Amino acid sequence: MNVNEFSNEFDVLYNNIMSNAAPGLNEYEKSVLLTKAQEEIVKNYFEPAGNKYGKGLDDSPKRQIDFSELIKVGEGVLNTSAPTITFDKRAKVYDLPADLFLVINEAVDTNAGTKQIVPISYSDYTRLMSRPYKEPVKYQAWRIITTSINNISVELIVNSNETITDYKVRYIRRPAPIITTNLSSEYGDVTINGVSTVSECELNPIIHSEILQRAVELAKAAYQGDLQASVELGQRSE
Amino acid sequence: MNVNEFSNEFDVLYNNIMLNEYEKSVLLTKAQEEIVKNYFEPAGNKYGKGLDDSPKRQIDFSELIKVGEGVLNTSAPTITFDKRAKVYDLPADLFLVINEAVDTNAGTKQIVPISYSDYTRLMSRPYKEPVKYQAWRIITTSINNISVELIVNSNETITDYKVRYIRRPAPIITTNLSSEYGDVTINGVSTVSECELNPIIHSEILQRAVELAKAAYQGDLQASVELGQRSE
DSSP: OOHHHHHHHHHIIIIISOTTOOOOOOHHHHHHHHHHHHHHHHHHHHSGGGSTTOOOTTSSHHHHHHHGGGEEEEEOEEOOSSOOOOSSTTEEEEEOOTTEEEEEEEEEEETTEEEEEEEOOHHHHHHHHTSSSOSOOTTEEEEEEOOOSSSOEEEEEOOTTOOEEEEEEEEEEOOOOOBSSOOOOTTOOOOSSSOOSOBOOOSOGGGHHHHHHHHHHHHHHHHHOSHHHHHHHTTTTO | OOHHHHHHHHHHHHTTOOOOHHHHHHHHHHHHHHHHHHHHSGGGSSSOOOSSSSHHHHHHSTTTEEEEEOEEOOSSOOOOSSTTEEEEEOOTTEEEEEEEEEEESSOEEEEEEOOHHHHHHHTTSSSOOOOTTEEEEEEOOOSSSOEEEEEOOTTOOEEEEEEEEEEOOOOOBSSOHHHHSSSOOSSSOOSOBOOOSOGGGHHHHHHHHHHHHHHHHHOOHHHHHHHTGGGO
């Protein structure tokens, strides 16, 4: 469904049938609520505990097809542009793509073959570095986030006497906002995520109805406006 | 009822089952203007019903309803209160507006006559545009006419502006006033003028004129103030 259909069925589901009908929502408000509902839905469906099914990214066909249009593959750029201080002397710093929402798969291609990057926790890092070896298992590499400015910088730890040729990252692209109409105005240009032009929902049509329902629920919680509704509907932001 | 019938049956009601024709014309013109206002406002009449609240009220204003286009006021380069306001002149014979629509490139949009309070409220928010099927309208500097600022959404152009309104009633005159009365006019017309309204409301216009005459001739202050309540 295109943006006009988002807005028309938003109006239908919000106030065109309600008995003591409420004021219609302005297009900026509808775009804001739709973008919020989109992000909430993405976060709810990525995490199993966030939805009533207990199903995350790839726990069912529907969850695969939900994020299928939001998956992207890119590469981390070696961060030798400027000097820096790494926590580990034997780690190579890489910069992830700017439009990164969530990392789901990483791999590094070295001279000793491809290796799956395992994101190790800080307590896990301490445990592993208290051991005599201090290097990954055969077909794996280690990873920790380092000092990041304006984009995520990442330290890749591989086994000794190994060089990294490329660093691929299969991630979830940051969703683009849903903007119903050109938000340009003479009184001031308002933006949802830095863009005023019309922006279609760049995800699969399977969850457009879900985004619409969530947006309507958020609109009605805003209309109710007491602390109660804000608190319970803020639980699903996550 | 022809004007002769108005004058003749005024005598039946006012002269105890049988005034100058100018005085009768003045009162009949005043009576219809009262009746139009009272039956327009729901609170002005005895039934609590306005323009479209019953079949009778619809036939009452049926012959006054007129549809006309507003003309762009590009001749005079005046100053508008809103940046994106296009000044439009309304028809000269305008009494009360009841529907306004504007035809843009994006589509027809129903004009909402927005109050001075609501404007300040809606213009204190981030976006400051109407809803996607509506336009705003506020009256602006007007000279011997009605001028309206059409504040439609930016990124849109106005191609048309239709106004459905109540036309100003013509005077009721029962004789050529210039024949006996030097240069007296009722609303700028000295000759015989018929009632331009539906025959359904002719009786109420005649009855109101008779009441206005009797109160005017009785001369009591209380009667004048009491029946002056219904003048709005």
